[PDB]
Amino acid sequence: MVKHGVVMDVTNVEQAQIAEEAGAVAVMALERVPADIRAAGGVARMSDPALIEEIMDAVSIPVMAKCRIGHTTEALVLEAIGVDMIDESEVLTQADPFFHIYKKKFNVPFVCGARNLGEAVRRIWEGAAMIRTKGEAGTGNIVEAVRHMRLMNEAIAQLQRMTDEEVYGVAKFYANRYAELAKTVREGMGLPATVLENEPIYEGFTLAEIIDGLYEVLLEVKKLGRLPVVNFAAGGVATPADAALMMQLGSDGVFVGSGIFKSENPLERARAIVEATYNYDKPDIVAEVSKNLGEAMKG
Amino acid sequence: TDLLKKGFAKMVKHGVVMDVTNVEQAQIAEEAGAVAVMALERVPADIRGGVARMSDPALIEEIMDAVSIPVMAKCRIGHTTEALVLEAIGVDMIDESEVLTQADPFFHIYKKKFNVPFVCGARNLGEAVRRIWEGAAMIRTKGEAGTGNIVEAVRHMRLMNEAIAQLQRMTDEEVYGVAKFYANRYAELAKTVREGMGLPATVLENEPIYEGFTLAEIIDGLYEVLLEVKKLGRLPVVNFAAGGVATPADAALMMQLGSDGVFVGSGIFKSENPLERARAIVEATYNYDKPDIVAEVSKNLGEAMKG
Amino acid sequence: MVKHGVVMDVTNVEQAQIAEEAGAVAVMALERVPADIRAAGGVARMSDPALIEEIMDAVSIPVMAKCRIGHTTEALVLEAIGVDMIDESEVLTQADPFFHIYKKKFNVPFVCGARNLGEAVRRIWEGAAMIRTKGEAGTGNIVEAVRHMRLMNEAIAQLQRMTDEEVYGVAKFYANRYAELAKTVREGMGLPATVLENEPIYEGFTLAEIIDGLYEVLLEVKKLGRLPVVNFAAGGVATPADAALMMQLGSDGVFVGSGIFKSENPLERARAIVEATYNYDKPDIVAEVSKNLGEAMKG
Numbered sequence: 081m082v083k084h085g086v087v088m089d090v091t092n093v094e095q096a097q098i099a100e101e102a103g104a105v106a107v108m109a110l111e112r113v114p115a116d117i118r119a120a121g122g123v124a125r126m127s128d129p130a131l132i133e134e135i136m137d138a139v140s141i142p143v144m145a146k147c148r149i150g151h152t153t154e155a156l157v158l159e160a161i162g163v164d165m166i167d168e169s170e171v172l173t174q175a176d177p178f179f180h181i182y183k184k185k186f187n188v189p190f191v192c193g194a195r196n197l198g199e200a201v202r203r204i205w206e207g208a209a210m211i212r213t214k215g216e217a218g219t220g221n222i223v224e225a226v227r228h229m230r231l232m233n234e235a236i237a238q239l240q241r242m243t244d245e246e247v248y249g250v251a252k253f254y255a256n257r258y259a260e261l262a263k264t265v266r267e268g269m270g271l272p273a274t275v276l277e278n279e280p281i282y283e284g285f286t287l288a289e290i291i292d293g294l295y296e297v298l299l300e301v302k303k304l305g306r307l308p309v310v311n312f313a314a315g316g317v318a319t320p321a322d323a324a325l326m327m328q329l330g331s332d333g334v335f336v337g338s339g340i341f342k343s344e345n346p347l348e349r350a351r352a353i354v355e356a357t358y359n360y361d362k363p364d365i366v367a368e369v370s371k372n373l374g375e376a377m378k379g
Numbered sequence: 380t381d382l383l384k385k386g387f388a389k390m391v392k393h394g395v396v397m398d399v400t401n402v403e404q405a406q407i408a409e410e411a412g413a414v415a416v417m418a419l420e421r422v423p424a425d426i427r428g429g430v431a432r433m434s435d436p437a438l439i440e441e442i443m444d445a446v447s448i449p450v451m452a453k454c455r456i457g458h459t460t461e462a463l464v465l466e467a468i469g470v471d472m473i474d475e476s477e478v479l480t481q482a483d484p485f486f487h488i489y490k491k492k493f494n495v496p497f498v499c500g501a502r503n504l505g506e507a508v509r510r511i512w513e514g515a516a517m518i519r520t521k522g523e524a525g526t527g528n529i530v531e532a533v534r535h536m537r538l539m540n541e542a543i544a545q546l547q548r549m550t551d552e553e554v555y556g557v558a559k560f561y562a563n564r565y566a567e568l569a570k571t572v573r574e575g576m577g578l579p580a581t582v583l584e585n586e587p588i589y590e591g592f593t594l595a596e597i598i599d600g601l602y603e604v605l606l607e608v609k610k611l612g613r614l615p616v617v618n619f620a621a622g623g624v625a626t627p628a629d630a631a632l633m634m635q636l637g638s639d640g641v642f643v644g645s646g647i648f649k650s651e652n653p654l655e656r657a658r659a660i661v662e663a664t665y666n667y668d669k670p671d672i673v674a675e676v677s678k679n680l681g682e683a684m685k686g
Numbered sequence: 687m688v689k690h691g692v693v694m695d696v697t698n699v700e701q702a703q704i705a706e707e708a709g710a711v712a713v714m715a716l717e718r719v720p721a722d723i724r725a726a727g728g729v730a731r732m733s734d735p736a737l738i739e740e741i742m743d744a745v746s747i748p749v750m751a752k753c754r755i756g757h758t759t760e761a762l763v764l765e766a767i768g769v770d771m772i773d774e775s776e777v778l779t780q781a782d783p784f785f786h787i788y789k790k791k792f793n794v795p796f797v798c799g800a801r802n803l804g805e806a807v808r809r810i811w812e813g814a815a816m817i818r819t820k821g822e823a824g825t826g827n828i829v830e831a832v833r834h835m836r837l838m839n840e841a842i843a844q845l846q847r848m849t850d851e852e853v854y855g856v857a858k859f860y861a862n863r864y865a866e867l868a869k870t871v872r873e874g875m876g877l878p879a880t881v882l883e884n885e886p887i888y889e890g891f892t893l894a895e896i897i898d899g900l901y902e903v904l905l906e907v908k909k910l911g912r913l914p915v916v917n918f919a920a921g922g923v924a925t926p927a928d929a930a931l932m933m934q935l936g937s938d939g940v941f942v943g944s945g946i947f948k949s950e951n952p953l954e955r956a957r958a959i960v961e962a963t964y965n966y967d968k969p970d971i972v973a974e975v976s977k978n979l980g981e982a983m984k985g
C-alpha cells in the first residue's frame with residue numbers, strides 16, 4: 081500500500097506512463113476523468129477490465145481502479161483481474177443507496193472517500209484500508225478538500241478530549257446511519273420508523289454490535305490522534321501549491337485526477353505536483369516548480 | 380391453469396429475459412442464450428414522449444414465429460382488453476408494466492381470471508403482495524427501465540429483502556396488521572367518490588370495492604399471501620430483477636442479492652456489440668458467483684448504454 | 687417466606703394475637719393502620735423497635751415491619767432486631783425521593799409494592815423477594831387493587847407474545863427511571879438533561895448494566911407467565927368477597943390492614959377473610975362467612 085506521494089488518474093497507456101515518468105507513486109485507471117464525468121453525466125461505471133489490464137502491463141507501479149459504491153460484483157471483478165487497490169468512490173454512479181461494500185471479506189485493499197469523521201469511521205469499520213478525505217472531484221477548486229480536512233482534524237482534536245464513555249456516545253450516534261433501511265421498511269409496513277438494537281441490519285451485525293465496532297475504531301483514533309489508516313487528500317488539487325497545502329494540513333499524500341491531464345502541460349505539471357508534495361515545507365521549491373507551468377485546469 | 384401458471388415461471392428462473400423489437404434481435408437473443416424474449420415496438424430507453432401502448436399483434440406473432448423460446452408481451456396497467464388480446468394471440472406470458480402508459484389509475488388487471496400467466500412489477504413488499512393476490516404468477520422487482528442505472532433495481536430488492544426479513548419476526552396477529560395496512564390502497568376510489576358526493580372520505584369494510592371483493596375480504600386475501608411469504612422467507616412466486624441491468628457485473632449483483640433471474644431491455648441493443656454483450660450477461664447470470672467468469676466476459680465488450 | 691394466606695396489620699399485642707387466632711399467615715407490625723395514616727397525616731416512620739419485639743414475642747407466626755422507601759438505616763434496624771420480612775412501603779412517608787433500598791445486600795427478605803410491571807421488575811431487580819400489587823391502602827375500596835392487578839396481568843400477557851429482542855426494548859424503557867437524578871443534576875450544572883449509558887447511576891451500576899438486569903428479570907416473567915416472586919394483592923380488601931376477588935384475579939394471597947380492625951367485629955371479620963381466601967372458588971363458603979358479619983370499614 082502507498083504511504084506517501086501522488087496518485088494520478090489515467091485513462092490510457094500513454095497517460096499511465098506519463099504519470100510514472102513524472103514520479104507518481106501509483107495510478108488510478110479509469111475511462112473518464114472526474115471533471116469529464118461531472119459534465120458528461122450519464123451512468124459512470126467500472127472501467128473495461130481490458131483497459132485496466134493494459135495499464136497494469138504498461139507501468140511498474142501499483143494500479144488502482146474504482147467501482148461504484150455498493151457494487152460488490154464490480155469489486156470482485158477488479159480483484160479477480162488483480163488490481164492493487166479498489167477505490168469505492170462517489171465519483172462514479174452509486175449502485176446501492178443503502179450500503180457500502182463489506183470490504184473486510186475481500187483480499188485486495190480498498191480506499192474509501194470520507195467527508196467527516198463519522199464517514200471515515202464507518203468506512204474503516206466496514207474494511208477500508210485507506211481513506212480519501214475528499215471534497216469535490218472535477219472542480220479544480222481546493223476548498224472542498226480543505227473544508228473536509230479541517231472538519232476531520234477538528235473532530236479528532238475534540239475526540240481526544242473525551243472520556244471513553246463520551247466516545248461511546250459518539251459511536252452510538254454514528255451507528256444510526258446503518259438503520260435507515262430498516263426504519264424505512266418498517267414505516268412502509270405501517271409501523272413506527274424505529275428499530276430494536278438487537279436485530280440484524282448490516283452483514284448480520286445488529287445495531288448494538290455496529291456501535292461496539294465503531295467504538296473500537298474511535299478509540300484507535302483517540303489514541304493515535306489521527307485515523308488508523310493511510311489518509312490522502314483528494315478532489316480539487318490543480319496546482320503545486322494546492323498539493324503542498326494539503327500536506328501542511330496533515331494529509332499523508334494526494335490524489336490528482338483532472339488537475340494534471342486537463343491542464344496545458346501534463347508531464348511538467350505532474351512532476352511539479354510530485355515535487356511540491358515531497359517538499360511541501362520548502363516554499364522556494366514549490367515556487368520554482370510553479371514557475372512557467374502554463375495553463376491549469378479551468379473548473 | 381393455477382399450477383400451469385407457476386409451472387411456466389419456474390422454467391424461466393435462473394435465466395435472462397431480453398427485450399426485442401424485431402426478428403433479428405429475437406434471433407440474436409436466442410443464440411445468445413436467453414430463456415425468453417419480451418416483444419415490444421420500442422425499448423424502455425426509447426419509450427422515455429408519447430403514449431406507449433400494447434405492440435401490434437402482428438409484430439408479436441412474427442417474433443413468436445421467429446424463435447423457439449417463449450415470448451412475452453406488455454400491456455398497460457389495468458388494460459384488461461389489451462391483455463385479452465395478448466392472451467388470444469397466444470403469448471407465453473403477459474407483463475402488466477409501468478413502462479407503458481397506465482390505462483386505469485385506480486386498479487390493476489384482475490389476473491386470476493386469465494389462463495395465461497402474468498408478470499408484474501413491484502417496488503416493495505406491499506406492491507408484490509397486492510400484485511400476487513391479484514393473480515401475478517411472477518414478480519419483477521423493478522427499478523428504472525431505460526436508465527442503465529442499476530441503483531433503482533438494487534434499492535427495491537433491498538427494500539423487498541428487508542421487509543421479508545422483518546415479516547418473519549412477526550406473530551400471525553402482527554402479520555394481519557400488515558395485511559390490513561396494505562389493503563387500504565384498494566379503497567382509494569371509494570373514498571374519493573364519497574367525498575365528491577359531499578360526505579366524509581371514509582369507507583365501510585363490508586362494501587364491494589374491487590372485483591366484487593370487500594375491504595375485509597381483501598385483507599384476508601393479502602393476509603394469506605403474507606403468511607406464505609413468512610413461511611418461505613421469500614415471495615411465493617418467481618422474482619426477477621429488472622431496471623438498469625447494463626453490464627454483466629450488474630446482472631451478477633442482482634443474483635447475489637437474491638433475484639431468481641434478470642430482465643434486460645435497453646442494456647443489450649442500445650450498446651455497441653449486442654450479441655456479444657447479451658452472451659456475456661447470460662453467462663454472468665448463470666455464474667454470478669464466479670468472479671473469474673464475470674471478469675472474463677466483461678473484457679473488451681465495447682461501449683454500454685447510459686442515462 | 688409466606689406463600690398463601692392473609693397477612694394482617696396489627697398495632698399491639700392484642701391485635702397480633704387476634705390475627706393469629708383468626709388464622710393469619712403472618713402479621714404486619716406498625717404503630718398506625720394505613721387508614722389512620724392517610725387521615726392523621728404527619729410523618730409516618732418505622733415503628734418503635736420495642737413495639738415490634740413485643741409483637742414478635744406474642745405470636746408464633748412470622749412478623750413483618752415496614753420502613754420508609756429508601757430508608758436503608760431503618761431497614762438495617764429492623765433486620766438487627768430480627769423481623770422476618772421488611773416491607774419498604776409507600777404507606778409511610780418516603781425518605782429518599784430518587785432511589786429505593788438496594789435490598790440485595792440484606793439478609794432479611796423484602797416485600798415491595800408495585801402498581802405495574804415496570805415497578806415490579808425494578809423492585810425485583812433491586813432485591814425484592816415478594817411483591818405487593820397495591821392500589822390505595824386505607825381507602826377500603828378494592829378498585830385500586832383490582833386496577834393494578836389488571837394492569838399487571840395484561841402487561842405480562844403482552845410480554846409473552848414478544849421476541850427477546852422486543853423484551854430488551856421494554857427493559858431499556860423501564861431502565862430510564864434510574865437516570866432521573868443524573869439528568870436533573872446535569873441540568874442544574876447548565877448542561878443538557880441527558881446521560882451516557884456507561885456512567886454509574888445506581889449502586890455503581892451503569893444504565894447499560896441496569897438494562898441487562900431488568901432484561902434478565904423480564905425473561906423470567908415471560909417464561910413463567912407471572913412474576914418470579916410471591917405476589918400478594920393489597921390495599922382495599924375490606925370484605926370476604928374482596929379477598930376472594932383478588933385470588934380469582936391471580937393473587938397468591940392478600941394483605942389486610944384497615945379492613946379488619948377498623949370494622950365492627952375484627953376477630954369474626956378476620957376469620958371470614960381467611961376462609962374466603964382459602965376457599966375463593968367456593969361461593970357458598972364466601973357467602974356463609976359474609977353472613978351477619980356486621981359493619982365494615984367506611985373508607
Ligand SMILES: [Cl-]
Binds near residue numbers: 257
Ligand atoms: Cl456514511
Ligand SMILES: [Cl-]
Binds near residue numbers: 277278
Ligand atoms: Cl432495543
Ligand SMILES: [Cl-]
Binds near residue numbers: 306307311
Ligand atoms: Cl488522519
Ligand SMILES: [Cl-]
Binds near residue numbers: 506
Ligand atoms: Cl399498488
Ligand SMILES: [Cl-]
Binds near residue numbers: 582583584585
Ligand atoms: Cl366498517
Ligand SMILES: [Cl-]
Binds near residue numbers: 613614618
Ligand atoms: Cl423473493
Ligand SMILES: [Cl-]
Binds near residue numbers: 808
Ligand atoms: Cl419505580
Ligand SMILES: [Cl-]
Binds near residue numbers: 248249252
Ligand atoms: Cl451513551
Ligand SMILES: [Cl-]
Binds near residue numbers: 912913917
Ligand atoms: Cl404474578
